Ligand binder design. Structure first.
Ligand SMILES: N#Cc1ccc(CNC(=O)N2CCOCC2)cc1
Ligand SMILES: N#Cc1ccc(CNC(=O)N2CCOCC2)cc1
Lengths: 304, 304
């Protein structure tokens, strides 16, 4: 029993973190097989970051300008290329700790673990969600760029995020491992405002199911609703619209608890309209939206 | 910027987890050097757990009855002994992945990371605190016993917790790695009620400092207080008394922010008396108490 904001075990990813230095800029790289992946802004001075021309800045860089250190041993760079907003540094040594891995581009509302790193060294692991506005709410100081986000399926690491940027509002933006930003953001020190940070409704419902499974039931009421009725309330409260696809995804949690998805929607509707009245659910005073239905099943069933 | 409930990177501990089976009971063990540490209740049937005599149950057990599996390779048990509530299984192979480590018995209010495991396989990592009533609020299903709690100082893992028990109230109890329970709990399926789960005041203040550092400042007020005045309010709200030792520990955060500890106490006093009025601090609608002053400094300074 008990329900925690749980990250994947980080060991498989710790074995992939390296330091990348280009001139006076140091950040993190990801070493998989004989390629090191890092943010292309490693080539920028802080001055460069106001309006960088990355292709032009890269012409001035040779393999020997990219210093890659794995622990306290230097890797030899034998090639480099830019793919979107990431550099791929080809090294002469395959990472012997390379796990089974994939690169995945996640959808908003999907959760992942972040291994926060500085100078190629892991500092901490925490659980994030891709927000509906394609930001994440992370914990990143200067030096953390190139820290990655991932999911694990048994022994396969799916890398979904590389840290690039903090917006002036202190939320975070980054890329998939093909170097494509999530959302509209660019690797430039310019005005970039995030859109509405809407609540991930299907995740809230998942977490209400987790609450019921773990004995927190006070919020269950005598009501039901319809998708259309619920969605009028969702809109009013800056919740994402609930689709039949979301209802389908919650089917296993509905089955386990015997609470129809639309009944849990009516419970959520009353919580939105009434608030918590000073009560808590799974030790939270607000409705938690960074657990997916898959996260709730995994944690409630003990998948390794 | 940003402030997250962050666990230590789990790799060093993942390399120590093994499966221990005794008859039909399987749980987790910790393999350090040539010793495997596990809960002594591995020797119990569920029937045994109502009123176990561990010394008597252990007489019926030989080295060959303790099946220890590290991945998919069996370890040879060449000795076994009971130390308090843990068994120490001597194996013929030193764990080649043994990190630098220590065994520490933590005090209430101290935080640590838990690597939740099943059948010797890591499932997840999360951050806990030792509650003032010597329970922890974990996420543990059947099979998770022998999962451990730890802190890391650079390359030294300090193990502070091994999971043994879920109370009928769904909170968790366990031992240090010498097998001594935290608090009054015993490894027996009997009535065990936890005492008052008081709020860890020094940790709340640390987290208010973290909030100010990360730009959440709405709760800062024009007031100060005294330790005695604050403590009258703490008592009323089931907060731990604040001591000068706690004020001393918060000194670095006071210095960094320029907010006197007693001024932050007066801000906390008003939050206790007024509530949040529907506002949030670092994305929380309640006052968070599972960050220590050391955690706030570490996370805010990027220690690896
Ligand atoms: N992609 C990207 C990218 C965009 C803007 C910048 C500007 N620098 C910045 O925000 N840092 C934050 C931490 O402290 C030092 C300066 C850097 C990288
Ligand atoms: N130390 C200890 C200890 C105390 C009581 C028990 C009784 N079993 C129990 O609570 N589990 C919970 C999970 O589902 C199956 C039964 C076991 C170990």
């Amino acid at each position: 029993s008990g329900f925690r904001k749980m990250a994947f075990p980080s060991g498989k990813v710790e074995g992939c973190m390296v330091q990348v230095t280009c001139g006076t800029t140091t950040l993190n790289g990801l070493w998989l097989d004989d390629v090191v992946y890092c943010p292309r802004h490693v080539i920028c001075t802080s001055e460069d970051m106001l309006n960088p021309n990355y292709e032009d800045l890269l012409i001035r860089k040779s393999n020997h300008n990219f210093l890659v250190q794995a622990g306290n041993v230097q890797l030899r760079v034998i090639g480099h290329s830019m793919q979107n907003c990431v550099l791929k540094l080809k090294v002469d040594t395959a990472n012997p700790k390379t796990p089974k891995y994939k690169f995945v581009r996640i959808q908003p509302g999907q959760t992942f673990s972040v291994l926060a790193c500085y100078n190629g060294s892991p500092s901490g692991v925490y659980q994030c969600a891709m927000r509906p506005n394609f930001t994440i709410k992370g914990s990143f100081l200067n030096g953390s760029c190139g820290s990655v986000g991932f999911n694990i399926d048994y022994d396969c690491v799916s890398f979904c995020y590389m840290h690039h940027m903090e917006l002036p509002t202190g939320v975070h933006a980054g890329t998939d491992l093909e170097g494509n930003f999530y959302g509209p953001f660019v690797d430039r020190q310019t005005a970039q405002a995030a859109g509405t940070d809407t609540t991930i409704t299907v995740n809230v419902l998942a977490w209400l199911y987790a609450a019921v499974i773990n004995g927190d039931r006070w919020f269950l009421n005598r009501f039901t609703t319809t998708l259309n009725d619920f969605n009028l309330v969702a809109m009013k409260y800056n919740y994402e619209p609930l689709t039949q696809d979301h209802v389908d995804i919650l089917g296993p949690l509905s089955a386990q608890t015997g609470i129809a998805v639309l009944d849990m929607c009516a419970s959520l509707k009353e919580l939105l309209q009434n608030g918590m009245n000073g009560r808590t659910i799974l030790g939270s005073a607000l409705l938690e939206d960074e657990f997916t239905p898959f996260d709730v099943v995994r944690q409630c069933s003990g998948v390794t």
